[PDB]
Curated annotation (Swiss-Prot), chains A, B, C, D, E, F:
Modification type Phosphoserine: residues: S19, S47, S51
Tissue: Expressed in neurons. Isoform PNS-tau is expressed in the peripheral nervous system while the others are expressed in the central nervous system.
Domain remark in the UniProt entry: The tau/MAP repeat binds to tubulin. Type I isoforms contain 3 repeats while type II isoforms contain 4 repeats.
Localisation: Cytoplasm, Cytosol; Cell membrane; Cytoplasm, Cytoskeleton; Cell projection, Axon
Range covered out of full length: 623 to 696 of 758
Protein name as catalogued: Microtubule-associated protein tau
Top-level taxon in the UniProt lineage: Eukaryota
Maturation and modification: Phosphorylation at serine and threonine residues in S-P or T-P motifs by proline-directed protein kinases (PDPK1, CDK1, CDK5, GSK3, MAPK) (only 2-3 sites per protein in interphase, seven-fold increase in mitosis, and in the form associated with paired helical filaments (PHF-tau)), and at serine residues in K-X-G-S motifs by MAP/microtubule affinity-regulating kinase (MARK1, MARK2, MARK3 or MARK4), causing detachment from microtubules, and their disassembly. Phosphorylation decreases with age. Polyubiquitinated. Requires functional TRAF6 and may provoke SQSTM1-dependent degradation by the proteasome. PHF-tau can be modified by three different forms of polyubiquitination. 'Lys-48'-linked polyubiquitination is the major form, 'Lys-6'-linked and 'Lys-11'-linked polyubiquitination also occur.
Assembly description: Interacts with MARK1, MARK2, MARK3 and MARK4. Interacts with PSMC2 through SQSTM1. Interacts with SQSTM1 when polyubiquitinated. Interacts with FKBP4. Binds to CSNK1D. Interacts with SGK1. Interacts with PIN1. Interacts with LRRK2. Interacts with LRP1, leading to endocytosis; this interaction is reduced in the presence of LRPAP1/RAP.
Modification Omega-N-methylarginine, positions: R44
Provenance organism: Homo sapiens
Positions of the record's site feature: Not glycated: K6, K12, K16, K26, K35, K38, K65, K70
Crosslink site: Glycyl lysine isopeptide (Lys-Gly) (interchain with G-Cter in ubiquitin): K6, K12, K16, K26, K38, K42, K48, K64, K70
Length: 74, 74, 74, 74, 74, 74
């Protein structure tokens, strides 16, 4: 056997922007209620129960570049 | 067997920005209620129960670059 | 067997920004209530119960670069 | 001239009630905005401008009895 | 001239009640904004501007009895 | 001239109540903003500007009895 692997990138991921400027995030309130009895959870679990949650995310550049490799072999 | 692996990057991830400027994040309140009896959790668990949570995330550049490799072999 | 591994990066992750400027994060209050009886937790567990929590995260550059390798072998 | 006035009451205003019991008043939030320039007001004025207001009025007896007289004369 | 005035009351205003009991007043939040320039007010004025206000009024008897007289004469 | 005035009351205003009991007044928060330039006020003025205000009024008997007279004469 012979194996070779060479994922070249000259990749570019880019933004020009003049001004992010006037951004008003202004949420009025709210009401949440959850009931239960028993809660089991097991192995890989991401839960939220009964959340009231506001965000304001203003990156001046948000150029995510996700990349993955797997040369699995038996 | 012979194996070779050479993921080259000349990758670039970039932002120009002039001003982040006026950003007003101004949340009014709220109300949360959770009930339960029993809560089991096991192995890998991320939980939130009964949260009220505000964020304001203003990076002047947010150019995440996630990268992963796995040359698993048997 | 022969194995070789050479993930080269000349990678770059970058931001120019002129001013982060006027940022007002101004949350009004709130109300949370959680009830339970029994809480078991085991192995790897991240929990929050009954949180009310505000953040303001203004990095002048936030260019995370996450990278991972695993040449597992048997 | 002769004038006489004798509004007799043996009036009765009444309530029996066994229990006022389970009353849940649970309003989620809201958002109000008012604009103006000039506001004049004069003589007898009752105003509200830009209100967000909740009530819960549970009298165990609410037997108002309004009564008025006026023997005006010239 | 002769004038006479004799508003008799044997009036009664009444309530029996066994229990006022479980009363939950639980308002989630909210958001108000008012703008103006000039505000004049004159003579008898009751104003509210930009209120966010909750009440819970549980009298165990609320038997108001309003009464008024005016024998005005010239 | 002769004038006479004799508003008799044997009036009664009353409440029996067994128990005022479980009363939970539990307001989550909120947000108010008022702007102006000039504020004139004159003669009899009751104002509130920019209030956020909660009450819980639990009288065990609230039997107001308002009464007024005016034998004005010229």
């Amino acid at each position: 056997v012979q194996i070779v692997y060479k994922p070249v990138d000259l990749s570019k991921v880019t933004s020009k922007c003049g001004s992010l400027g006037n951004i008003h995030h202004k949420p009025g309130g709210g009401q949440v209620e959850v009931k239960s009895e028993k809660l089991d959870f097991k192995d890989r679990v991401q839960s939220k129960i009964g959340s009231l949650d506001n965000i304001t995310h203003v990156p001046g550049g948000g150029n995510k570049k996700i990349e993955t490799h797997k040369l699995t072999f038996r």
